[PDB]
């Protein structure tokens, strides 16, 4: 019994909120023994007794004990949570709402265990997170409230972000591109990212830029036939969701967002093609509604015209989603929790490198308008370097697209560069 | 012209006449700027009164005859007339009884609003798919034109659409209300 | 319409958490019109647009706007809460959990109205309280 104090402490608090008047008192006495035996420090005082009339609405009392112990009794954390989750499933609907109430304060304490000198306790925290992910998938009704408490608050701990984000990708990977498990993890990242916009944005982008950079090792005729295609597809759905309301920090990552848009336009199933169109419409909108940057009244008029142009039937054809009345409807699916996506109509349109110029020159017009205000900007000089790396490197799926873009944006060319272009033609 | 067709009765023959007359009233309201009207407003109200009586749903099942499926088209055709007639029409009650003008309008607005709402519930697919989709689309477009002209006397009765049960119908009511605010 | 800014504000926020991708976007535009027309003060900035892909898990966004308006827009309180309760009953189970999240910040503003010189606003607050009392009796699971 001495070895498992945390496991008993959850039995006391779960049964204090029961509906049997003779079981609340039985739990009060057990709680009294634990504090004396283990010298746990709490706010008030407790005295064993028999015959107490404990009220049913015993909710703000439980939350005060759990909150106090969590503050000044951290070592119980790992073994407490493991038990609390296990009791979550077995309890009824009404008791489930209670487990959330007193579970949340403990989640702060995972800060220290996540980097506990790789003592195999780090392996434990990741196991707990995998358990939390499974509750979210199944408890559809309580979805609006799990996001605000568990993920909303757990995502405000800077040191803990890296491990939490990593588990999201692995769970989605097993499901697949259209699987429910991968669809849900895309939504949850929105709540996680609200705490630290500047850190989740520069960490989901940083993974995409590397997966694309690793297709060079095993060149393939097309991306969809590459082994790493599934990794690229799911990571794109994350970028779609994070783009709304400026949760992808555009004022710092605009070069790395256009760079990826040009390598994805008009590739994939019809669902993935309406996502790329939506992503562009949200990056432009974020510019017009950002406070960090101070665009003069002239520039803001340039953007608003671009915002309308991209929604014309002309650009629906360029992106390759013609015959679709609205992109929003196709991009999202209502029954995304119940069933997995069901792709069909494998017949897939072709792409023409002349279309890529028209898009690649519309974006370049937007970027230059911004640089006029932003002093000593580096956006265009960063984008060129990214293109210049794929342009002169053998990759039969990305090289053609990286040449049409290298020329459309570059502002200076030397004799040494021209020979490479003319020797790729030979 | 309507009164004679109004009293014609119900039959496979007489139904087709009603349909064609309804299509005339739609074409007559695309040339309203060219024509000449002695009293434009007082005339548009009566036509709405005489045409609302013909939009009767679920009357082909009680009749128990598929030969009278035309009544489905008559309701589809009738609504298009009511949409065109209603576009920009302030309400004005006939002065047959002595009551306050402001009160008479609010009463009048609810008279038509409930009529459309009842026809809207029936068109739900849960309660031919193209027919219901088209008729349902018209039944809301007709309602939007009714509200825009009469915001003062009909906004209160209309707020209940915000929590309507059809998701596609809630978006339209919100788009309408967005315009109303923006206008000065 | 100029006399009911609070009655509309609840329609925009309730439907932003909907499950129809073409009903979130329509509701976002309505919210934009309200702030400009009525000079409501919010944290960020909003820009009317068409074609936006608004994510489904749009929960901490609503709670942030609602919390801001309640802090620095109190006069809307009474007519806002009356509508929110009325919208509680008609909504489904999942949307019921949303209404709780962004309803709470407003409750703290009833202080001023409870003793508003017995201007018949005091009779109003008691009407709201009796409405809350009825939710508690019926919603056993929550």
Swiss-Prot record, chain A:
Protein's cellular compartments: Nucleus; Nucleus, Nucleolus; Cell membrane
Modification Phosphoserine, positions: 342
Post-translational modification: Ubiquitinated by RNF7/RBX2, leading to its degradation.
Subunit structure: Interacts with HTR6. Interacts with SPRED2.
UniProt free text on domains: Binds phospholipids via its C-terminal CRAL-TRIO domain. Binds primarily glycerophospholipids with monounsaturated C18:1 and/or C16:1 fatty acid moieties and a phosphatidylethanolamine or phosphatidylcholine headgroup. Has lesser affinity for lipids containing phosphatidylserine and phosphatidylinositol.
Disease: Neurofibromatosis 1: A disease characterized by patches of skin pigmentation (cafe-au-lait spots), Lisch nodules of the iris, tumors in the peripheral nervous system and fibromatous skin tumors. Individuals with the disorder have increased susceptibility to the development of benign and malignant tumors. Leukemia, juvenile myelomonocytic: An aggressive pediatric myelodysplastic syndrome/myeloproliferative disorder characterized by malignant transformation in the hematopoietic stem cell compartment with proliferation of differentiated progeny. Patients have splenomegaly, enlarged lymph nodes, rashes, and hemorrhages.
Protein name: Neurofibromin
Lineage: Eukaryota, Metazoa, Chordata, Craniata, Vertebrata
Name of the coding gene: NF1
Residues of the full protein shown: 1847 to 2272 of 2839
Swiss-Prot record, chain C:
Source organism superkingdom: Eukaryota
Subcellular location: Nucleus; Nucleus, Nucleolus; Cell membrane
Organs and tissues of expression: Detected in brain, peripheral nerve, lung, colon and muscle.
Coiled-coil intervals, chain numbering: none
PTM description: Ubiquitinated by RNF7/RBX2, leading to its degradation.
Disease linked to the protein: Neurofibromatosis 1: A disease characterized by patches of skin pigmentation (cafe-au-lait spots), Lisch nodules of the iris, tumors in the peripheral nervous system and fibromatous skin tumors. Individuals with the disorder have increased susceptibility to the development of benign and malignant tumors. Leukemia, juvenile myelomonocytic: An aggressive pediatric myelodysplastic syndrome/myeloproliferative disorder characterized by malignant transformation in the hematopoietic stem cell compartment with proliferation of differentiated progeny. Patients have splenomegaly, enlarged lymph nodes, rashes, and hemorrhages.
Record function comment: Stimulates the GTPase activity of Ras. NF1 shows greater affinity for Ras GAP, but lower specific activity. May be a regulator of Ras activity.
Domain comment in the entry: Binds phospholipids via its C-terminal CRAL-TRIO domain. Binds primarily glycerophospholipids with monounsaturated C18:1 and/or C16:1 fatty acid moieties and a phosphatidylethanolamine or phosphatidylcholine headgroup. Has lesser affinity for lipids containing phosphatidylserine and phosphatidylinositol.
Oligomeric form and interacting partners: Interacts with HTR6. Interacts with SPRED2.
Record protein name field: Neurofibromin
Source species: Homo sapiens (Human)
Residues of the full protein shown: 1847 to 1988 of 2839
């Amino acid at each position: 019994p001495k070895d498992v104090p945390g496991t008993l402490l959850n039995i006391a608090l779960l049964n204090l909120g029961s509906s049997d008047p003779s079981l609340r008192s039985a739990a009060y006495n057990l709680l009294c023994a634990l504090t004396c035996t283990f010298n746990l420090k709490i706010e008030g005082q407790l005295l064993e007794t028999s015959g107490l009339c404990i009220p049913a609405n015993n909710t703000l009392f439980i939350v005060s004990i759990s909150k106090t112990l969590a503050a000044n009794e951290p070592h119980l954390t790992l073994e407490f949570l493991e038990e609390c989750i296990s009791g979550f499933s077995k309890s009824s609907i009404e008791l489930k709402h209670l487990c959330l109430e007193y579970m949340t304060p403990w989640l702060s304490n995972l800060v220290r265990f996540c980097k506990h000198n790789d003592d195999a306790k780090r392996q434990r925290v990741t196991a707990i997170l995998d358990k939390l992910i499974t509750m979210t998938i199944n408890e559809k009704q309580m979805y609006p409230s799990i996001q605000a408490k568990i993920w909303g608050s757990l995502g405000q701990i800077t040191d803990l972000l890296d491990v939490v984000l990593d588990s999201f990708i692995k769970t989605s990977a097993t499901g697949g591109l259209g699987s429910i498990k991968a669809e849900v993890m895309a939504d949850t990242a929105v709540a996680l990212a609200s705490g630290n916009v500047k850190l989740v944005s520069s960490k989901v982008i940083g993974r995409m830029c590397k997966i694309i950079d690793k297709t060079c090792l095993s060149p393939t005729p097309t991306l969809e036939q590459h082994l790493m295609w599934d990794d690229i597809a799911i990571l794109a759905r994350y970028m779609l969701m994070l783009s709304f309301n400026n949760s992808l920090d555009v004022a710092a990552h605009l070069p790395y967002l256009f760079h990826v848009v040009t390598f994805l336009v008009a590739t994939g199933p019809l669902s993935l093609r309406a996502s790329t169109h939506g992503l562009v419409i949200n990056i432009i909108h974020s510019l017009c509604t950002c406070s960090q940057l101070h665009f003069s009244e002239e520039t803001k008029q340039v953007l608003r015209l671009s915002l309308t142009e991209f929604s014309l039937p002309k650009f629906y054809l360029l992106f390759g989603i013609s015959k679709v009345k609205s992109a929003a409807v196709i991009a999202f699916r209502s029954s995304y929790r119940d069933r997995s996506f069901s792709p069909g109509s494998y017949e897939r349109e072709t792409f023409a490198l002349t279309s890529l110029e028209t898009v690649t020159e519309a974006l370049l017009e937007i970027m230059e308008a911004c640089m006029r205000d932003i002093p000593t900007c580096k956006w265009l000089d960063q984008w060129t370097e990214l293109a210049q790396r794929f342009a002169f490197q053998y990759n039969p799926s990305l090289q053609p697209r990286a040449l049409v873009v290298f020329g459309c944006i570059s502002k200076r060319v030397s004799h040494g560069q021209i020979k490479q272009i003319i020797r790729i033609l030979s | 012209l309507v009164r004679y067709v109004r009293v014609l009765g119900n039959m496979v023959h007489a139904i087709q006449i009603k349909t064609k007359l309804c299509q005339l009233v739609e074409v007559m309201m695309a040339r309203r700027d060219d024509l000449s009207f002695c009293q434009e407003m007082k005339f548009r109200n009566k036509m709405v009164e005489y045409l609302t009586d013909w939009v009767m749903g679920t009357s082909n099942q009680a009749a128990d005859d598929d030969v009278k499926c035309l009544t489905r088209d008559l309701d589809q055709a009738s609504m298009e007339a009511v949409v065109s007639l209603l576009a920009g029409l302030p309400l004005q009650p006939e002065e047959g009884d002595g009551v306050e003008l402001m009160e008479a309008k609010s009463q009048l607005f609810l008279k038509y609003f409930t009529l459309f709402m009842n026809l809207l519930n029936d068109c739900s697919e849960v309660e031919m798919s193209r027919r219901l989709a088209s008729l349902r689309h018209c039944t809301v477009l007709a309602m939007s034109n009714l509200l825009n002209a009469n915001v003062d006397s009909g906004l209160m009765h209309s707020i209940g659409l915000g929590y309507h049960k059809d998701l596609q119908t809630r978006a339209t009511f919100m788009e309408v209300l967005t315009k109303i605010l923006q206008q000065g």
